[PDB]
Amino acid sequence: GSSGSSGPPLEINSRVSLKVGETIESGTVIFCDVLPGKESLGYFVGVDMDNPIGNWDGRFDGVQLCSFACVESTILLHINDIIPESSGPSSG
């Protein structure tokens, strides 16, 4: 685990793309957490694309982690793979 921040890094119900193959695909955020025996890998994230290009219903070896997910548009991958489009607050 870690310390400092509390909760998912990627904004929920937001718009973010995903690096698939040799191209990116815009999508929406819904799930952002780790997986059993895959905590060291990082933090998986399920993005709900607008087009039918998903591949994750929201399960792991039988167990269900994401209910909102669906094997049609949603896509669980590494956050680093996701490509958001926000700047956030400023200050200088």
- Name beta bridge partners: 17: 26, 83
Q: How far apart are alpha carbons 80 and 67 in whole angstroms?
A: 23
Method by which this entry was solved: NMR
Pairing of strands 23-33, 44-49: antiparallel
- Is the domain spanning 14-85 CATH 2.30.30.190? The answer is yes
- Spans of all domains in the chain: 14-85
Q: Which residues of 53-77 are buried (b: 16+ CB within 10 A; e: fewer)?
A: ebebebeeeeeebbeebeeebbbbb
Secondary structure (H, E, C), the chain = CCCCCCCCCCCCCCEEEEEECCEEEEEEEEEEECCCCCCCCCCEEEEEECCCCCCCCCEECCEECCCCCCCCCEEEEEHHHEEECCCCCCCC
Alpha-carbon Rg for the chain in angstroms: 14
